[PDB]
């Protein structure tokens, strides 16, 4: 959640937050996301903070998760399925890899996944 | 904001540069004959 320290990812302000929220939603829903390198980098700490909130989730944490995510089914699955799955991992639940760039705009492409072990 | 000074129209076009108006006057008939001699595809509007 550290400030980007420079020009935001999605155009002007008020859009990077929604972009990161949608990316975290897609991640927690599918189990793997393929995005741009900087987008995945900015999502890594966001997704890790959301996973920590889920882990600590007993009460008042569902509210903190819902104030950032809107998909009720996504929140429910992130709270139930994941749940204590990371109760032993003391951080670092998101793995980031770099893949070949796409055509047109040569944007470094990255892929984020949830560690399973 | 100008109208570009074109303002397309069919009725006014035919009324101001039509075959009837070109044949009414003598100079119009002369111009039509000159165009026909030159071989223009469209004599008038």
């Amino acid at each position: 959640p550290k400030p980007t320290k420079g020009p935001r990812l999605g155009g002007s302000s008020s859009h990077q937050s929604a972009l990161l929220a949608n990316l975290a939603t897609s991640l927690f829903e599918h189990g793997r996301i393929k995005t741009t390198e900087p987008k995945a980098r900015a999502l890594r700490p966001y997704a890790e903070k959301l996973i920590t909130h889920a882990k600590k989730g007993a009460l008042h944490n569902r509210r903190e998760v819902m104030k950032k995510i809107r998909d009720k089914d996504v929140v429910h699955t992130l709270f139930a399925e994941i749940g204590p799955f990371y109760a032993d991992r003391n951080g670092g639940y998101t793995r980031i890899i770099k893949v070949e760039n796409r055509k047109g705009d040569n944007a470094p492409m990255a892929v984020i996944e949830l560690v399973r072990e | 904001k100008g109208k570009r000074t074109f303002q397309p129209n069919n009725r006014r076009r035919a009324r101001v540069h039509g075959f009837r108006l070109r044949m009414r006057t003598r100079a119009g008939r002369a111009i039509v004959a000159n165009r026909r001699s030159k071989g223009r595809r469209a004599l008038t509007a």
């Binding site: 890899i97 770099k98 893949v99 070949e100 892929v111 | -």
Partner: protein, 54 residues
């Protein structure tokens, strides 16, 4: 600001030669038994198969 004179052929080519590209480093990787070259950046993804190999 406009070009006053015509740049000479040498004055043009000396700098045009700078507009070049840098080839990327490659790394040998064993996938499906066959060995193929993939940059070290995508080396990790090559193992998992997230890098298509035409």
């Amino acid at each position: 600001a406009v070009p006053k004179r015509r740049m000479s052929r040498a004055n043009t080519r000396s700098r045009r030669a700078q507009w070049k590209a840098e080839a990327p480093g490659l790394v040998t990787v064993s996938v499906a038994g066959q060995q193929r070259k993939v940059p070290r950046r995508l080396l990790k993804a090559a193992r998992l198969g997230l890098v298509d190999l035409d």
